[model samples]
Target chain A: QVQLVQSGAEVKKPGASVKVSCKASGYTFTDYYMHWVRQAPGQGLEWMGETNPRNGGTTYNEKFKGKATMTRDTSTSTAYMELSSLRSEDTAVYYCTIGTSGYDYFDYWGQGTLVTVSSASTKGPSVFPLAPSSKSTSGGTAALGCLVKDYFPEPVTVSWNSGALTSGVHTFPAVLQSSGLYSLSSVVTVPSSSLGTQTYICNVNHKPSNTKVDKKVEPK
Target chain B: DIVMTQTPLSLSVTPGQPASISCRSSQSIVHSDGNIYLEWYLQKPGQSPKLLIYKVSYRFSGVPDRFSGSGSGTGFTLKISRVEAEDVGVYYCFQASHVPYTFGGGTKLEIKRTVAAPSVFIFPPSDEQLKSGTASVVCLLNNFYPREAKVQWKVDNALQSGNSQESVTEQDSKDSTYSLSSTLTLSKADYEKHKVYACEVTHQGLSSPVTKSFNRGE
Candidate 1:
């Protein structure tokens, strides 16, 4: 029966401020905790901060401190987040989530409120490899990934250590980012036993700028 | 240590009455994927701590229906709809959602006992004690009701001299029973002079005192 209902979307000008509200109901407000998260359009989720409605005790993600302020109205059981000095980079969907004191994850999430910072900018593609050997090669194979992000032109080509080896490789389609740019991911898998003894490389070619990027990794 | 804090460190309740305990974490226990790892445990007398509730509210396979867990994220509560005499012991809340999983300082459940007797056991000195040229006699009194009890030592059926300092009376955290202990120390020569080392426990619940003896030769 618990529910978190968030405010509608807002379009703001650069250098302005915007406030979003989330109304909690069907349960005791102060009994649980509230958290905020940001998803920049197609990007992943980022933690903002959390607040205890019972006491108004709040903690901010180091990145959001000073830039974001959170408050609540106990009478109405509504939680709010105010953002200042808005910029294009701040354009994203903000979500209000509910969690409790003992668990470290969110349970009830509000329908997100979208904030649009009209004035924005863009840049060419930047390439980097995944923190190599991140997880297990438990299934007999190791996964190597390359990230090509924030590129203006969508046409980009990715390769492994060599220019023509195409076994166990997948390059996903370019996805448009919140910045109006593009980002892509490429994954390469090899024998798990080949780790520690072998080295791998990610090569990206963006034709518009005639830029070539090479990133190397050793899955040790 | 995530700082797990519990409330009502001890509770004395009547049989058939209900009880509740609170556990709060310094931070939220919500996992990004939406699982809460808060748990509740009960330790009955002379037994292991048993899981009653896990992941915040789900009862363990064999847990009783009278118990329930509630709350989300950072604060949780464990409730017993009806307390039983067998439920006397200690209860603990644990959090596994963060690094350095922590446990709440235990809460003891006590119920007044009208009649309950203790089982006494005696342990002889260990190799470590023998090497020290002294013998240590340990007597354990277990599963008694009513925390009040008396302990004394006897050498060859002769009353010995000692103070309450050498004895300890404790309520078992796992159950509503009480356990008492006393240790007697004597030099090897004096120990060899005595044929029997005995411990006697007297309590209101017992018609006669409970005595456990250790034979030096054995």
Candidate 2:
């Protein structure tokens, strides 16, 4: 029952500094090392580096070499990461993991904490396509959904587009992940005869302007 | 920074057949504590990567015994005794011996099996049978269908693409299939921390390639 609990989402501006924390329990705190990872905005995983909670020693990925610092307090069984002189590119979800004793990849991880950078409270919507599943109806039609993540500036408009789009077309959504980073979805279905055509799209209209992010589903 | 290099960028394999991937580092992975930290990982298709081997030859928890690691210092190898359907994926060798952990590009393993593979054997000098201070590794294919058998040799998992392996095949006559054998030699330079010589047999009919490893000193 080893667990690593992390800090909550944070919003800051350029040049602002923030320190994220992770508290470990259920195992020897000083036994294994705590590793840090960064998922910038919508990018893939980046290894920010690792830290030994016992000796407070740390190692940084060359990318994060000076931008990030890792430290820990053995007495409190807690590990910390501080990011300074932040910018918009630094907006992302940071994760702390601990599944090995030394020199290894981590398996166990903490719920990621989102960090968004803006001059003065900014927000927008991101669109993603859900894999389509088989249909029992439509005489052989397949159905799919459009999902939006971390949408802010609340109440985003979701639309369905295909050869011919309709409402409630028998749609479904997978359960959101552990956190709220993944919210809801809008769905559309194609007739059995149109499966081979490979045309599906999701249109998202966000606020603060005419900013729109449309995601097209590639044929499977 | 120890450079890591692997051979046969890709392997076509079938279920139940054995396969081996070799890795060599530019520098010794041995740590000040007298331990090596070279590791192996498997990145399954459409899934997260999983660590398979660590500390040179120790398998990670939950790893199947069929998957084994052996090597010392700069030379190391990962051997799969019997590949299964779930084993289809890319294999990688990484070095944790130094900071800024590094990983090899990766060897892609594809699933496709057809016929029995060649049987390989490594002959070691009995001290009494010492010849040129080297050993011989032989590969054998018995009653295997198809006249095609490609035998490859690796010392510490290197192609030496340039090496002492000379391949030859002869008909079993007892049966229609043929027998193939390849000789791989090792000089005195391969001793120290142990050397692994592997025999890789590839045939048109074998969906999975067959691999056998011979460790130095018996």
Candidate 3:
């Protein structure tokens, strides 16, 4: 069977860089052109450009002129696209397809790869083990979970607060799902010092939904 | 480098109206061998798009008959009849007959909208798992030698016991190369376990099984 297998998800911070790959099988690798496409956070698919596998010639979408580069390794029947100077907005799913000559449309598409961006460390809950002085007194630990769905290549962020207001300590962790989804969760532990009648809230940032869904937690 | 352009400029077709777009290549597509390498495509607003034609005028198998293509050399046209609301979107014409094939700027065909619908050969009557008691498999050959090739199916390494395989051929005038497709249908039960479906292709310099594998799917 003819199939195109794609590479894994990538995690990077703003200003960092990343590259993804698509490997083709069942046909002469250099016989056709491989095209790259971009699906921004919640946006429809857009053509990024194409590369000639035989001679390594490439053309880019005017919009992606500086952000994306296309290349191919005919020997391995694989195509690659590298994104440079990745900012939070650059996070999006990228895909490769077989381009019919003279036609700019993709005939065969590769499943996409998601890339996430963030500034915090790549691991651990956004909230840490230590109780925050502001919340430790609350007698309970407040954990925050952030989930992003249907968005490719963009990172999601979660924050926590008290009293439905924004002024609370926050933590963010890099979480990558196998299906190419990016998310980060932050947890703020209510310190014992600030326990009396405290209200903790979790807020998440995601694409397509510019608004946040805030979940509230009260100390037990 | 020749540029191909599409005409009928800005589209203004209403639902249920017939629509057509003309594509003209900068140069003649007729190769010395007398074949044309042109194709047509449809890209709906939010869909992945589909192939309407390949090799100038031949419709891809299963493509609706209402969508037809005709023309040769530098001038070609794609016509869609009884255009439905779902048929709205940009249409493109591509020429693969030349090295570094190029696509024409697309023409939007809308409301007037309407719509639509792999390889492997195994030999030796391999067991194929099917969900519906029936399965279809196709074998494709590319960059075939001697400019022509044919595909045949075999079961259990033996010619399929009494089933006939159907073959189709397409030629690329630009390169003087040709591609062929063959499809076979088999019983879901007979295709189970260790069964092999093979594709044997015959061309000028080579006549052998390009590749083979076990049957899969319903």
Candidate 4:
């Protein structure tokens, strides 16, 4: 079986940069490309970028253009990412990963490393929200929500599309009630041109550790 | 089944510091099995890494609310809320959704000038305990590196000199090429001090101090 052992956690302040690592074992390291992800406290996940360990080529999320860099070391079977320009919003857990191709989903993953950014002393590992799902109303609109179950505070994003949705969608504030679950919701209006037969999807995006949950709905 | 590799850019940081990790695959993870075996992890300094997300974007039980995950296909993400001081160390992702599992290179997060913590060592004598009087005790450093690490003995927090401590640094000619050993002759007084005896290790790369202690009789 293949396994990944990651480095330690990090604590930084706004305007500072931080990097984390993941080490691969039990397999040939040079065969696959390594991917990087981001997750903020109480938010969904987002894809920062990926790197081909074999050839050293890389692709980054547009939002990460100035904030993230991807690299690899074939000798040690390891991949890496550097996040620059620290901000309070940057505090979160980050993970390195290898893609799972059997289906169309990223089924395999690694335990995340928490990078905390703060002006004062902070405690606890980075907290993640409950996974969220969305369903499109066919020709109407699609709605999605994420419930934050821990005290750690972080930003989150939700979006809608016909198939796989990329980053760059508007995000909403998560509703915190007396029940202790922080919930956030987003709505996307489906155009008539792509409705009535096509599928619409809703997705949640987090930072540092990029993880996504999507639901599809067909027109009535 | 093909494998994947990933790595992080930074090694250490304070709370609220923005950090990111990268994942790569040997072959496209998209498969006919309809299963995604990707996961992510966080390893705090000196601690074991814990599962953050599984099967791509599913959050594990007991994770904090500030954490989240997103992305799809061969790409994915895992995010944290505000970075905390305790959040120092490496972050990683692994793909187990398919065969030939793999992991990414790791990033380590460190504090600016805090005294580095010490390494930890644990040596269990054996399943059987020796009777009173004079007993020979063997001490093994579970995972020492460099094959030339120095082991020191201390009693009651004070350094001990000229103690009958023997060092054994042997390289296994086989698959288990990395192993280190030390032996100490203990009298009743030395054994009674077992509760206060500590093994201090000095090695390169680690900034913090690492020590291991054990009771002699128990």
Candidate 5:
């Protein structure tokens, strides 16, 4: 029944400071130890540090000694981690964990909080509509992809045929690139029977740029 | 391979008494698979090693509640809340966190069933040894039956040879048990860099080779 409710996703500019919180319930907060782990996209988990809620004392991984600071509130049963001087590489999903006795592993985990650090405030996403993977036949489906790249300030919207399409769509998160830009991909599945009879459109909107792009495709 | 070192080479405990053994790894025992690869085993005389605990502290099926494992990272402990007669044997802590699984030399537990197992002690480099520009760590064994026990030295998990001098085991007049001491001499620089040195002793009466280490970092 123990639960660790974490804060929502965060977006911050490079060299900025960000604080994430984890609120605990259904158990005695001071009785267990709290830990923080980091997992960047395409990277493995890294132990950030651990904290004792009783006295709010913390011990950090030597690699993260100065980069992260952990604190706790006894009254609210909340643990917080403040990351400073964040870089694009610091963009990751931060997880809060509880360490119980008798086992050297985390017993309970909080829904992770995604922290995105990038320098994307000045630019908008560039939308590229990709063709369907294969020709749609009767009783078949075709997969289409829209690659949005070089975006900033995150959260671009992708729709098929001006939001009229909704069925088979998968939108990926905004991924930060090494060049300090953001990229995202959205895929849509369509029926082969409709592909030859109708035109399909992929629409992308980047509010920061006050721009919207549309790409139309039809059967060859 | 990650080197595993255990503490208190031999134990002599009364029934219902608590006992604990410490295990330290040369590196963190957490594997890349997000699993702690620390395990504990008990090897009874003339029996294969039985798994007691795995993944740091999860008790194996059919294991008693009295036996538990604890600790994290590089340090760990295996404890028995109440010693039982069947627990008389050698306990080995293994590290499978890295390639080439390695086991601690082992801790021989004696639950009022002590027959001929020796209690081992290891001392760090003495002032005299340091003053002589070489580290001569000592390993002392006491109250062991049978005059012959093979003694070997391990530095940084490798079997070491030469610069080891041992004395003949002398019988104690009061207890009729044997006692002896051995010294392993090495360059002071080598001792400082390695820091993990263990003295392993094997005897016919022991289920596994009992070892004691003098780790500078600990």
Candidate 6:
């Protein structure tokens, strides 16, 4: 008789980032992983991703890589997903499904939470960098993918920058999603020869209101 | 590109016009696992959506065959052939293709309208110690076109759902409304702590549920 009760509905403006929560009961929390689902106005369901509350380890669908961040509060037996870069397209109801270490499919689901993204621009972009994939480039070079998003009125323009050598740096086209916001990921190839010697910095320029958001990440 | 794009944002039909919603993805939704990761759901106005199909075209047990799903590769279709009254709501197209699954916005189907209340009384847990060495309780929920009237119980504010004895609905000869009765049984130890017992009732007309409480001292 496991159950997942979710939070209430949210009415956020464009460019807003909302974190919805789900509280799990009737069973051991750590014994199962929480997977997320989204339903837009009349739209169908989408499987977002899942997080292992026991280890904080998470696996996300590539489409939600940066737009949705899944985390958990072990003490409260609650799981959370923060949907950033809101837009009218982001307006929808979200659900959290329960999966155990043994059963891979969703057997139990939380009550859905309706998130409405309006036309108002009450917030700005929240730009940052996440875990960098070491295998981003060929030739055994190191790379960094700067996460940029949360700008309002979606379809935002985002580009990147780094102080390292300009050669071999590739700035991919920002991924504009159903949430109406954009996710700009950039990768800078640092040759195996120069690992820690270069300044590992990341920056994204949000085109709306002409704002420049900066972030610095150190290579480990 | 792992894409599942849907069309026809909304559908307006009479009680008989069937619906055929289309969704085309950028690539084949069929994956290396040999499973086409697509699904469909139907959501009534304020009610939770129910899963109708999974893996492209398999319907859930109670789902009617009128609601059928089909397609492969990049194109998929969900066809509701025999349109029914309750089926008028919102239909969504879903895809578990790629990592993070994607969904179509949703197609809303509208038809005519259908739209209920209740007061609940939870009788005390009498000492059944004389009968079967257990405790029994009665919950009466009546008086209210209480649409889809149902009686539920909560122990310590948590729901109890294990095929409890809920009486069949009987129309009131006086007003033609519906009334329902349900009985809850437990062990003698459960009767001792009646403080955790409660009866809840809900109807389509109710925005929220109404509850009645019980306790040993009362």
For each candidate, the DockQ is 0.01, 0.03, 0.02, 0.01, 0.01, 0.08
Candidate 4 matches the true fold with a TM-score of 0.32
Off by over 4 Å in 3: A7-18, A25-77, A82-95, A99-106, A111-220, B9-12, B31-34, B112-218
After superposing all C-alphas onto the true structure, candidate 1 shows an RMSD in angstroms of 25.5
Q: A19-67 in candidate 3: lDDT tens per residue?
A: 8899999877876778876655434345567787889988765666687
Candidate closest to the true structure, highest DockQ: 6
Q: In candidate 6, how many Å is residue A190 off?
A: 75
What docking tier does model 4 reach?
incorrect
- Candidate structures ordered by lDDT, highest first: 5, 1, 6, 2, 3, 4
Candidate 6 residue-wise lDDT, B115-214, digit = tens: 3364454554322222445454545544446336767788777787762565433233333344454656566666665467787777786788777765
All models: lDDT?
A: 0.70, 0.63, 0.56, 0.53, 0.71, 0.63
DockQ of candidate 5 (2 decimals): 0.01
Error of 4 at A1 (Å): 2.0
The 10-residue segment with the lowest total lDDT in model 4 chain B: B169-178
Native contact fraction, candidates in order:
0.01, 0.06, 0.03, 0.01, 0.00, 0.21
Give lDDT: candidate 3, residue A39.
Answer: 57
> Please, what are the lDDT tens digits per residue for candidate 4 over residues B1-218?
34455555554333466545556666766545676666677765324466677766778767775667665777766666565555555667766554334556555544333222222333322212234343333334432334446777766677766553433322222211223334444565456555666777666536654666655443
The CA lDDT at A19 in model 5 is 95
Q: Which residue pairs in candidate 2 collide? A: A140-A192, B14-B208, B112-B207, B113-B207, B114-B207
- Regions of model 1 farther than 4 Å from truth: A1-220, B43-49, B85-89, B115-144, B148-181, B191-218
Worst 10 residues of 3 chain A by lDDT: A127-136
lDDT of 6: 0.63
Estimate, for each residue in B1-218, the C-alpha lDDT of model 3 and write its tens digit: 44678997447465567788999999887655567767787765334447788777788757888788999668999988867655656787876565445667778653311111012222121122144463444443433334335566776677753344443322222332333334455556655643566666665455343444444332
The docking category that best describes candidate 1 is incorrect
Q: Tens digit of lDDT per residue, candidate 1, span A17-135?
A: 99999999998898887878776643434567778798996777666768899999999999999999999789888888775433444545787877867653334576545433323
**Model 6 B-chain TM:** 0.49
Instruction: Work out the TM-score per prediction.
Output: 0.35, 0.49, 0.41, 0.32, 0.45, 0.45
**How much lDDT does candidate 1 score?**
0.70
C-alpha RMSD of each candidate structure in angstroms: 25.5, 22.6, 26.9, 27.1, 26.4, 27.7
- Cα lDDT tens digits, model 2, A87-141, are 9688777888885555455666787777866664444655545444331123464
